[PDB]
Amino acid sequence: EDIQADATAANASELKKALQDTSVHTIKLTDNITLTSAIELTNVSRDVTIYGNGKYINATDGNGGIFIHNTKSYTVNLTIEKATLYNQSQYGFVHMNDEGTDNITYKNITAYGGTLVWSQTHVGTKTLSLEGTVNFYSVPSYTVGGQTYSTDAFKIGDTTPAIYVSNEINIADNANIALENSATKIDIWMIADIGIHPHTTALTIGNNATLTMENGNNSALNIKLDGDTSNSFTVGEGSTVKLSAKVDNVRILPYEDSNTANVSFAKGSDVTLHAGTGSNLRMGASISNQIDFNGKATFIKDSEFDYYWNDQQKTGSTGVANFNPGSNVLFQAGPGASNVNTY
Amino acid sequence: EDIQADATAANASELKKALQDTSVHTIKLTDNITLTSAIELTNVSRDVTIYGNGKYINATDGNGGIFIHNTKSYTVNLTIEKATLYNQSQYGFVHMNDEGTDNITYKNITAYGGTLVWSQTHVGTKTLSLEGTVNFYSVPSYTVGGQTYSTDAFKIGDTTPAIYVSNEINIADNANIALENSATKIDIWMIADIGIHPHTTALTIGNNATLTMENGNNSALNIKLDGDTSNSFTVGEGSTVKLSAKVDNVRILPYEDSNTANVSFAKGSDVTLHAGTGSNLRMGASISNQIDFNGKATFIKDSEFDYYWNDQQKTGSTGVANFNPGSNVLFQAGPGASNVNTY
Fold first, then answer.
1. CB contact under 8 A, A309 and B328
2. Residue B256 burial by CB count (10 A; 0-12/13-18/19+): exposed, middle or buried?
3. Distance from CA of B62 to the nearest CA of A (A)
4. Which of A39, A245, B11, B59 has the smallest number of CB atoms closer than 10 Å to its CB?
């Protein structure tokens, strides 16, 4: 049954006012919205959900659609559901700065942009959680409302992310997540190296969920984890993951030393990784690199440098693979390649 | 330079007398010897080396050539070097019974037989050590001295070993060991389940050594370890191992529970395992099953039951593979097969 939203928004001004009002916890879009300026949140804590109501929001500003920049005592729990989100900004539709705790949730969202979600990586705790059907399109441009808009992407010495979130990316139970990349080099890039937040990265997939990032025609890397202290990539029970990339599917090589790295696939999961010239799993944490297999896994390799010897590469000295009941692992590679190698 | 042997032996009688004399520690063969009765050692400790002097010993008796059956306080350190040894007995050329500690050493030995070395597995500590060039031929018959002799092989519910030694088989540094099997089902079978000896099996290969047991046309298993408490197969630095079998290369499935199993390949080693229908490594110890990779390893699978899903099978729940610097592992298998599976 139904409930009344705290505000409605039919344009940019009403959306801004509702989002900046601390008394407003729910916002229903009553029309498609074009944001010509980023809606800023600063010196403020907010718990708020935007009910998209099948509408779109097209953010055309250089800072994004929603630009959060709080100091360390503020917390923003921002949810956007049932909407299409477009953004031109190199800092994504949701743009997160500074030491505030920012917890973004997308549910039933279709998103277009170059860089689609972006957070600073040297300051506060930044998380992105994904529910229901979420379809990310990293594109060079998009067309909406009769007009065409070029995207932009955050750059680091020739390298660009589609999703750039520091500490956590969570995919909920039963979610179905897809990212189709035709504009950026790394699908998912998480850095957590210095700052008040834990220096930790985790891409966590829940149960009966799917993640599909079939970008072997475009992306260099599907997942890059750069957590100073620890790095985890975990797939829950009965979940299905399919990743393809030109170089590595999962790259965990933190600049730094004194780090751990963990990859775990739970019972009933089905994981397929396809790499072109690099590795399905390239792990170089200094303390330990651990893979826990509980399910079905298929690693495919066609043939820090962009080429490798092996499906799994421990480029940072020393690896451990655990095989528990339910485990069923197959490595496929071309002539002269190895399946597990150390560097 | 030269030394005087304590005895010479030119026939069966002189060999028997020298072997049974506790004052004799070295014996030089001065002619080929045919043993029509097994030379027994009982109620006696002996430290003795037979210097074969390029001669042969053909043991035709049902109990073997040398039959050791001591109680627990006696110890036999028996070495045979630079000789060809033939045996008709199902209990091998050297036949070891009861609770005595028996340590056999072969150096520069060529051996023909069905079962070539055999020890009881429920009593004393039984070891076989191998130095220099040792060539084992498990054959249905042999011809020597103008006559032809049929071999016999120890049987256990349809299954026969070429080498059946309870606790240790040691291959020394720089040794080159080969076993060509055309008469028995299991190349090397070690059982240590009950009794006063430790319930442990270990096939230990030293450094810069080789083991070649290319019997994919004949043998079911290359190595079967059945130690109640622990089971190890270790290959030392810079050593080369090539094994081929119809079913499993290494099978470690002790009947029993509360056991560990360890397979380790040291740095610079080169290990190639080729299995037909079973696994390169079939490990089912109850506590733990651990593989340490430090070198180059190639596992080949063409396609307790005789067929498997996987190059490595943990049929006893739970496995761990460690990959250390120098590790370079490749699994090869046919369509529908896995590389690591659990049962």
1. yes
2. middle
3. 47
4. B11
**Cα B122–Cα B126–Cα B129 angle in degrees, nearest 5:** 150
Is A323–B325 a contact, with Cβ atoms under 8 angstroms apart? no
Q: Which residues have a Cβ under 8 Å from the Cβ of B279 and sit 6 or more positions away?
A: B248, B249, B251, B301, B308, B310, B311, B312, B313
Which of B281, B339, B343 to probe the A interface (max A CBs under 10 A)? B339
Is residue A219 one of the residues assigned to a domain?
yes
Distance of CA A95 to the CA centre of its chain: 13
Phi/psi at B19 (nearest 5 deg)?
Answer: -70, -30
B318 touches chain A (CB under 8 A): yes
Distance of CA B76 to the CA centre of its chain: 18
Which two structure tokens, joined as six digits, stand for B194? 């009950």
Q: Let me know: does B175 contact B204? Beta carbons within 8 Å.
A: no
Shortest Cα–Cα distance, B121 to chain A (Å): 32
Nearest CA in chain A to B337: A330
Residue of chain B with shortest Cα separation from A336: B330
Calculate how close chain B gets to A195, using CA atoms only, in Å.
33
Do the chains contact at B318 and A330, CB–CB below 8 Å? Answer: no
* CA–CA dist B255, B30 (Å, integer): 47
Residue A170, domain extent: 7-342
Among the partner residues A309, A319, A329, nearest to B340 by beta-carbon distance: A329
- Look up residue B323 and give its two tokens: 């990959």
Method: X-ray
CA distance B28 to A312: 56
CB neighbour list of residue B108: distance below 8 Å, 6 or more residues apart: B52, B81, B82, B83, B131, B132, B133, B134
Q: Is B73 near chain A, with CB under 8 Å?
A: no
Instruction: Say if A2 falls within a structural domain.
Output: no
Do B214 and B182 meet the contact criterion of CB atoms below 8 Å apart?
no
> Tokens at residue B255, please?
């009947």
Q: And the tokens for B274?
A: 């080729």
CB-based contact, A338 to chain B, within 8 Å: yes
Task: Extract the tokens encoding A32.
Answer: 């498609």
Residue B72 half-sphere exposure toward CB, CA atoms < 13 A: 5
| Count of domains for chain B | 1
Amino acid at B176: N
CB-based contact A302:A330 (threshold 8 Å)? no
* Residue B87 placed within a domain: yes
A117 found inside a domain: yes
Burial class (CB in 10 A: 0-12, 13-18, 19+), B67: buried
B335: closest CA of chain A, how far (Å): 11
Q: Which residues contact B217 (CB under 8 A, 6 or more apart)?
A: none
DSSP H helical segments within chain A, as ranges?
Answer: 12-20
How far A64 CA lies from chain B's nearest CA (Å)? 45
